[PDB]
C-alpha cells in the first residue's frame, strides 16, 4: 500500500538518458494509474503520454521497436483508466502506426502487411520487427476497443 | 603569426578515397604544415590561433595567450558538425586578428601610415568545395555580415588590414580513385565564392585535388610568409608610356602583390601619408583604405638620388616584374610613383617615389622617398615657403631626419587637428576592453545544454536528459550509479574495500589512467638514491 508515493518519482525516473529506465518508469505508471485513480495520477499520465510522443521522433528504428514494444500496454492500462485521454491515446497510436506505415514501405518485407489493412481479429514466430510492431500497435488497439465497448 | 580556420562543418564529413573524411585528410595537412615550417628556422616566434564554424562565443579555440599545447589540443578534438558559415567565421576571425592594433599604436590614422608596423596574419580557411548554407537556404554571393561593428571600425570600411593575407584550401578530393595526375607541376585555382574574397586580399586559393597536389600546395605555401606590405598599383595615366626598347600592348597593370620589408622591429622611415587633404578642423575623419591606390608614370625624370637621406630595403615580391623584364628590367633609369585620390589641396597625385630596381636585377627596391624629394634635395626663404606643400602631420617623422644635421623647427605648427585628438582615447579603452572581454571567454565553454524539450502537442517545464559523454559515475560514492547486474559482486566490493581500512582511500572502482601516460611526468614523483658515478 507504500506504492503510491512512488508517484513522487515518477517523472524524475522519466528524465532518464537509459530507454530501460524510462521503459520501466512507463510501466510502473501505468500500473499506478491501474490501481490507483487521483487527480495527480492524471496529470502524471498525461505528462508520460505527452514524452512518450515526444520520444517517436528522436530516436532511431532499433531504439523505436525496443521502445514501443513494451510500452503499448501502458497506454492500453491508461486509457482503461483514464477516459478523458482517449482521444490523445488514439492521435499518438495513430501517429505511432504511421510511422509504421512509412517503416514497412522502406524496405522488402516477406509477410507485406499493407494489404493486410482489409482483415479482421482472430479470437485470440520470427518474423521482422517492424511487422511485429505493427501487430502489436493493431493487438493493443483492439484492446483498448474491447475494453472502451464493454 | 598564423590563425588556421577550420570549418568542421557536417559537409566534411564525406569520406576520401583514401578511407578518411575530409576533416581528418584538413587536420593531417595542418600537422604536415606545423612540421615543414619548423624545418626553417624562424618558427620560434609565430604563435598560432584556430578559428571552426560555430557560435561567436564558441567560434574561436585557441586565441591570444594560449601556447601550442593548447591549440593542439583543440585541433585535435575538432568535431564536423554545422552548417557552412563562412562569413560570419571570416567577420569573427578578422575582429580576432584586429583585437590590439588600436592599442600599440598600428594604424593610428593620424600620424600618416607607417609601413615598419607590422603584424602578419595567413589565414587558410580550409572549406568545403560549394553549396554554403545560411539556416535558410543556399547563397552563392558570400557576403560579410555587419551587425556588430567594433569601435573604432568605420575608419578602414574593410575588414582585413594592411598586413592580413587569405589563402584557401577546398580539398576537392574525389571518392573512388582521384586518377587525376596529368598535370605534375600545375596547381590551379578553385574558381569558388572564395575565390573573390581572397583575391582581393591579396593571397590565392588552392584546389586540392590528390594528395600529391596537397603536399605540393603545401610545400608552395610555406615559401609565401614575409613581412606583409601590401599594395596596388595602376597603369593610369601614361597610356603605357614603356617606349624603350620596343613597343607596349596588358595584364600587368593592378598589381596587387606584397613586398618584403625585412628589419636589420622594422627600421625605417617616410611613411605613405594618406589620400586625402586634411583639413585644421575636421570632426569626422574620411575612412582609409587597407590597400593604398597609389599609381605610377613611365618617366626618366633624374632616376640619380644620391644623398644622406635614410635608406630603405622594402623589397618587391616578384608578381607582376614581366612588364619590367620586357624593357631589360629598365637598367640606370626608373620611372616615378604617385598617390591618387587628392594626394595635396589641389592637384592630381603628386610623385613621391619611384620603382628603381637594382644592380643584379633580381627583383624591385621599392625606393620609398620623401613625399616631394625634387624640391627638398636641390635658406634664401625658401624651405619656409616649401614647407607649405606638404601634409601639416607630415612634418613630424622628416623632422627626424632633420636631427641628423641640426634642429630649425619647433613644436609650433606640430598640430593636425583640433578635432581628430577629440574621441581617440575613448575608442581606444572601449577597443582594449573589447578585447579584454573577448582574450578572457575564449576557452571557457560551458554549454550545459542537455534537454530532449518534451513538448505537448510538470506541465510547460518538464524535459528528458540526455546522454552524458564524460559523466564519471561514481560507482562507490553514488549508489544510483550501480546497474542491477553486478549489483551483488559490486555490492560485496564496496564492503571489502570500506571494511579494508587502507590508506589514501578512493570511490572510482577502476580509474587506470587517462590518455597520455609520460614517462618522465611519472618519473618525477619518485626518489632514487643513486648517480651512476661509475
Known sequence: ?150 | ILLFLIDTSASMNQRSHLGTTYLDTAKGAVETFMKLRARDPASRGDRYMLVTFEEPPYAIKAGWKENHATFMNELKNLQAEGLTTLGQSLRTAFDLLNLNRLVTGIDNYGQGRNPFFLEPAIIITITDGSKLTTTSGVQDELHLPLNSPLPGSELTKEPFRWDQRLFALVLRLPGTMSVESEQLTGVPLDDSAITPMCEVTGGRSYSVCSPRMLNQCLESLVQKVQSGVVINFEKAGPDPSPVEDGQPDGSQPWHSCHKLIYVRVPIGHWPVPESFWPDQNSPTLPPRTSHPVVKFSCTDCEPMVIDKLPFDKYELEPSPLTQFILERKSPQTCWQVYVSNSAKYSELGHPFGYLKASTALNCVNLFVMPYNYPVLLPWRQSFESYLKTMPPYYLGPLKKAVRMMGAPNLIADSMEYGLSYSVISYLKKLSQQAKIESDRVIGSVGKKVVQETGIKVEYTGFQVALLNKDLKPQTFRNAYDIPRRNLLDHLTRMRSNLLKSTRRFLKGQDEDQVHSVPIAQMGNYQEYLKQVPS
Open chain 1, 1 to 150: 500500500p507504500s506504492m503510491h508515493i512512488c508517484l513522487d518519482f515518477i517523472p524524475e525516473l522519466i528524465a532518464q538518458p537509459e530507454l530501460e529506465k524510462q521503459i520501466f518508469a512507463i510501466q510502473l505508471l501505468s500500473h499506478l494509474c491501474i490501481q490507483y485513480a487521483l487527480p495527480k495520477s492524471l496529470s502524471v499520465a498525461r505528462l508520460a503520454v505527452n514524452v512518450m510522443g515526444t520520444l517517436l521522433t528522436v530516436l532511431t528504428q532499433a531504439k523505436r521497436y525496443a521502445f514501443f514494444m513494451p510500452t503499448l500496454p501502458s497506454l492500453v492500462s491508461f486509457c482503461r483508466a483514464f477516459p478523458p485521454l482517449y482521444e490523445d491515446i488514439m492521435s499518438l497510436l495513430i501517429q505511432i502506426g504511421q510511422v509504421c506505415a512509412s517503416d514497412v514501405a522502406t524496405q522488402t518485407r516477406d509477410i507485406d502487411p499493407i494489404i493486410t489493412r482489409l482483415q479482421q481479429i482472430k479470437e485470440k514466430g520470427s518474423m521482422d520487427p517492424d511487422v511485429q510492431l505493427c501487430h502489436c500497435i493493431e493487438r493493443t488497439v483492439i484492446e483498448i476497443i474491447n475494453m472502451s465497448v464493454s
